[PDB]
Amino acid sequence: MADEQPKKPVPAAEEAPAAEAEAEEEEGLHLEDDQEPREHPIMGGIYDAPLNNENGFDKEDLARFAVREYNNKNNALLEFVRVVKAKEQVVSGMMHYLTVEVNDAGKKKLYEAKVWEQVWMNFRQLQEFTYLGDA
């Protein structure tokens, strides 16, 4: 595989957004109590990732979570439409590399997002967010 960031350190998280409303929004599933909770991914190399919770709710929560996670820190304010790729990774816990389609003022494209979550540390956040061409 290309091996982008399968083995490397991670930045420092902070929190999620809340203020500054948006304009439009995709149409898929409705969240609960706002925010976008995470899921419990399983081990696996850069390929193994059937995503049992691919019903839409889980994938949406993660996709929006990662996007908003890197979009709230400072990046622009875009909106994801849905996930197009899913991969699993093991590093000091459980890392999930999933790619989703994002839109911004009409600009549609496909961006990859890698989230990390441990079990002994009880922590989860976004590591990196790459912007690809289009799905």
Side-chain angles (χ1 to χ4, degrees), residues 67-120:
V67 184
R68 175 169 263 198
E69 181 60 40
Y70 94 84
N71 277 109
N72 84 89
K73 40 169 217 150
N74 76 118
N75 227 84
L77 235 305
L78 33 63
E79 46 258 324
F80 99 100
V81 288
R82 53 205 161 191
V83 309
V84 61
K85 320 197 177 217
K87 280 100 219 280
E88 305 258 21
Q89 181 126 220
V90 188
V91 282
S92 289
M94 290 284 123
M95 217 174 262
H96 196 79
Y97 291 57
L98 81 173
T99 331
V100 315
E101 268 183 295
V102 189
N103 187 294
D104 210 340
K107 273 264 274 288
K108 181 98 195 262
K109 269 100 92 77
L110 167 49
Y111 314 145
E112 215 220 48
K114 58 209 76 159
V115 188
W116 181 55
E117 178 257 329
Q118 326 89 66
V119 61
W120 56 85

Side-chain angles (χ1 to χ4, degrees), residues 13-33:
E14 218 218 296
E15 262 218 329
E20 206 208 52
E22 272 196 312
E24 290 276 313
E25 196 158 35
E26 64 140 283
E27 280 265 28
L29 276 153
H30 276 97
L31 273 292
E32 200 54 275
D33 270 65

Side-chain angles (χ1 to χ4, degrees), residues 24-69:
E24 290 276 313
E25 196 158 35
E26 64 140 283
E27 280 265 28
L29 276 153
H30 276 97
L31 273 292
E32 200 54 275
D33 270 65
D34 219 324
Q35 278 300 287
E36 313 281 340
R38 63 97 175 77
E39 209 250 309
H40 53 277
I42 185 171
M43 53 217 136
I46 311 296
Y47 208 87
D48 312 289
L51 218 103
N52 212 322
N53 282 127
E54 64 142 293
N55 312 279
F57 185 73
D58 269 294
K59 74 176 226 218
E60 271 221 337
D61 294 20
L62 174 43
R64 210 297 218 290
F65 179 69
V67 184
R68 175 169 263 198
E69 181 60 40

Side-chain angles (χ1 to χ4, degrees), residues 3-17:
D3 275 70
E4 217 88 33
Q5 306 284 72
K7 212 148 172 145
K8 265 215 181 207
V10 312
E14 218 218 296
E15 262 218 329

